[PDB]
Amino acid sequence: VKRTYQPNKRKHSKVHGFRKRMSTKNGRKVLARRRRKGRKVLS
Amino acid sequence: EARDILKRPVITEKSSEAMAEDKYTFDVDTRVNKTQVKMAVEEIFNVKVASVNIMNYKPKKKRMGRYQGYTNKRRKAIVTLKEGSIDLF
Amino acid sequence: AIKKYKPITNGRRNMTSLDFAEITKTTPEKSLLKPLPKKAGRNNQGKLTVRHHGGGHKRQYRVIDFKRNKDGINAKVDSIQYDPNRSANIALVVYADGEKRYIIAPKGLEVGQIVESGAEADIKVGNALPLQNIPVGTVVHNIELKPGKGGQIARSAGASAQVLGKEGKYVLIRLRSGEVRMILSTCRATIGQVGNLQHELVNVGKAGRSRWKGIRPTVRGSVMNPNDHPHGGGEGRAPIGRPSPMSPWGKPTLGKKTRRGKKSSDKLIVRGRK
RNA sequence: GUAGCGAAAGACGGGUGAGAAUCCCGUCCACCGAUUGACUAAGGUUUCCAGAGGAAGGCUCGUCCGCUCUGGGUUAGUCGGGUCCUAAGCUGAGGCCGACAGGCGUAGGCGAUGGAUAACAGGUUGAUAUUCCUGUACCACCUAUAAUCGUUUUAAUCGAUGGGGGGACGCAGUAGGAUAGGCGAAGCGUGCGAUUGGAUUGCACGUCUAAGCAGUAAGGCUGAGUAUUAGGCAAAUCCGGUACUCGUUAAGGCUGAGCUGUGAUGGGGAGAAGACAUUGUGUCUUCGAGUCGUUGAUUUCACACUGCCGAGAAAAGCCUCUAGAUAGAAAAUAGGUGCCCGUACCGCAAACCGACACAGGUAGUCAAGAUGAGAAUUCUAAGGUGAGCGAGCGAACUCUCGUUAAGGAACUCGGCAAAAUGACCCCGUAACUUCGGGAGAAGGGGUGCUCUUUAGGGUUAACGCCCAGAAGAGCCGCAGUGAAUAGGCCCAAGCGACUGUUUAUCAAAAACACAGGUCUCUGCUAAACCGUAAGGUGAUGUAUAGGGGCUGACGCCUGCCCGG
RNA sequence: CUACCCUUGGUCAGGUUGAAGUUCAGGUAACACUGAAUGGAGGACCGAACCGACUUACGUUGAAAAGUGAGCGGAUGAAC
């Protein structure tokens, strides 16, 4: 049957990914949280 | 530039069969275009160059005993000579 | 006239439509066309603000000359065409140098006849004049409300108002809804009734024909749930168990007047109905 | 030492090995065949190809890959994207609004799922190919090359920051025209069968591109010329309304147009071994093999034409006409030159989404013969695959399947399930109705094969070539749409008018919608709604309109009470 | 994923009925009714692809955290 999660590269870079997170202030807060935790991938 | 843009030759059986004709295969800097590669092999090896084809090879996944990683990416040029030849070995 | 359909399907049992016999050219003018994308009741925040607007046929906007500006230059009526954006038909006029415009087609208007604007113009069907120069008792349509703004009143199919009398800088005019009003005497209006009069009589016939005009369905309040509508809930069917009937946003809906106090046009409206 | 080992046909011989129901080769058999085939997207990211050991991996072994090593392996002026264009949206200097954070919004930007744009044939690897090689082309840019236009105003050229046109668009239906593919035949080739016969005999075959020369099958055309000018922010020599000459001819005047013949190509390839001393005779340097003739025809012409209402993007590329500007060009040759990103492999699946080598899901394109209306059904070509670790023996019971004496709903909550009906042709068909229907009502009959024949569809040339025109005369069987696939019907009541929609995953309905009614609000910065506001929807609408409530096709109708 | 919507694209074997309209003629004559040719309408009919999910059997430490088999509704539209 059809599942949740049908992947798409452009959509994945467009809702997450660096320039979308830097474009709002709460998004910049997720990148600051992820830096401060020391995550290997920020997005 | 002109001598940092050609890095290595490539020696394989496919590349050898290409050198049965006048084709030579180099590993080049990954930021150069193919006009620069034509100009560089004309400057270095003193020949005339018919055409050059080019392709990018992705990084390749690799293992060494619970160490995983990638190779470097490669830019391979294949240049066809018009006249002259090149004496690598 | 109106054509009746033969009952060959249950969906065509009582269906009628117009025969489109006033339409004389079935293809619009290319230079007077604009796009009209649908915005099916959703505002600039993208949320649904008016219910029941949906997706019908694709249409295109025809730009209509609602202010009759070109003045002292007569125009020949070229064709009467169909317009999906209104219930009147439209008329293509060509001015004496070659400028084409669309106007609203009045009731008896013929291909070939002459049409003009201004104070110098004369009282026959489709001429546009200031309300000052229009004799008392005639029927007019496409009536401006502020001078130069363009016509705003009585533009739909079969609509007209008539001039009743003259104040100082106002005229008295009786609108189609039966209210009488004062309009500035320098607002224009065109002579005659708006055509396509049988538009009110077409029976739509089948649910899907409504969907071809962009009407989504409407579900009544009394079969929703109590968080959805004030009429909602109840075990079986239920009466409207309130003192009055309500909106879905909870305002009394059957007789409560909603015009606001202290509008500036309250002193312009001498006698109102509906 | 239990359940399970995930749908499907395998058998034998050889080989290889320490060891084979498992791996490889062979032969036979089988399965899918509108697909378990062949391509292209998305997605995945080295799984692709060779070697060699697999300590684990696989519902085995390794004596494979999806572990190791590299040996690796992806080649573009023309393919798909960017150096083009805009839609929905998303952003947006100045601007507006807002405790802050921030929201909105102007020109403008960005943004394909659409528009625009130049390549085909053959050869070749273990692994790529419209990319490499060979041939033949096409498109751009730059520099030289010459005759031509020669107030540089104008002038073919330049050329708007300018204009007009085009690009440029629904749905249905029909009639044609071509062509792809399939089809029979002596044009031409191969072979002559072992079990009885026959030898007109079993077959097979006929080629080939983009580009460039010629013409062309049909399509649209108030169809070709004179003067004027409220306008095209000004110039136009171009765009519109009229007053006229052949006028409604379509000659052929024009634009556009499927396609055909020549050359491309006496090259490639060819049903061919006729060419080897060899490349393990497979292979090839040499040397040729036909380019006939019917039959009937999807896709394209073209949303061309006709009809209809619900009235069917934009912008650039492009074509015109100009100010203006300069000398001044261009053109046709010869040369150069043509960047970046993708490209391997899986791909209706063992490589994607599903924890899995999961009976699910996954957009588009191509699709041969028989039978038929058909892409249905059954068998089959091509091509794929024998199912993927499980396999060898032979009760109760459970599940799938087939048969059943006599009886025929007696079963049961209930004819649930099954059985029965079914295709085509011919005869016939009620009540009731909104006159459409009901209706395939019900109910009857027929169907194989052979020969005459008078004759149809004619294959018509005509009986011959198939179905038959359908009529006679025969033959066989238990049975003739001999398989498979293909409506059960009638009578009577409830509810709901109808097609439609609904509780993803226990409810598809009498519930919701609906076309119609009716009430009520709203005169336009409308009411209503979203928002703190600005903004916005309503609506680029204007009382024959818009929002809300109740009712629910149609027919006959819709009584009393205004005290609360 | 799902519910609505917006822009821009795509897909739908084959059969059957035969609307508005046109046109000729049995009864025909004040053509005129109704017979025949034409025409091709429809939230039409039957039925593949496609879309659904009514009954049933099987599955229920399932092959599967909603499926399979056989029947079944829709199938030019308020379609997918």
Author numbering:
A (entry chain 2): 2 to 44
B (entry chain R): 2 to 90
C (entry chain C): 2 to 275
Relevant lines from the article:
The NPET, which is lined mostly by the 23S ribosomal RNA (rRNA) chain, initiates near the PTC and transverses through the large ribosomal subunit (LSU). Four ribosomal proteins (rProteins), uL4, uL22, uL23 and uL24, of which the globular regions are located on the ribosome surface, extend to line the tunnel walls. The mutations in uL22 including insertions, deletions and single amino acid substitutions are mostly located on the ß hairpin loop of uL22, which extends from the globular domain of the protein and reaches the tunnel wall. We present here the single particle cryo-EM high resolution structures of the apo and ery bound SAuL22m mutant ribosome, which demonstrates how deletion of R88-A89 in S. aureus ribosomal protein uL22 ß hairpin loop leads to ery resistance although it does not hamper the binding of the antibiotic itself.
The single particle cryo-EM structures of the 70S ribosomes from apo uL22 mutant S. aureus (SAuL22m_apo) and of its complex with ery (SAuL22m_ery) were determined at 3.58 Å and 3.2 Å, respectively. Erythromycin (ery), the first macrolide antibiotic that was introduced clinically, is composed of a 14-member macrolactone ring to which two sugar moieties, desosamine and cladinose are attached. It binds to the ribosome NPET wall at about 5–7 peptide bonds distance from the PTC 15 and blocks part of the NPET, thus preventing the progretion of nascent peptide chains. By the superposition of the SAuL22m_ery complex structure on the two apo structures above we could identify several conformational changes that occurred upon ery binding; At the binding site, A2062 is 45° rotated, U2585 is 110° rotated, G2505 is 90° and U2506 is about 3.5 Å shifted in order to accomodate G2505 and forms a hydrogen bond with it. Interestingly, upon ery binding, G2505 is about 30° rotated towards C2610, which is 45° rotated, to form a WC base pair (BP) with it, where this movement seems to be at the final step in the mid-way movement shown in SAuL22m_apo relative to SA50S_WT. Nevertheless, the tip of the beta hairpin loop moves towards the tunnel wall and a new cavity that adds to the tunnel width forms. Upon ery binding to the mutant, in SAuL22m_ery structure, additional grooves are formed, which leads to a wider tunnel. Thus, it supports the idea that the uL22 mutation does not dramatically affect ery binding site, but provides an alternative mechanism for nascent proteins progression through the NPET.
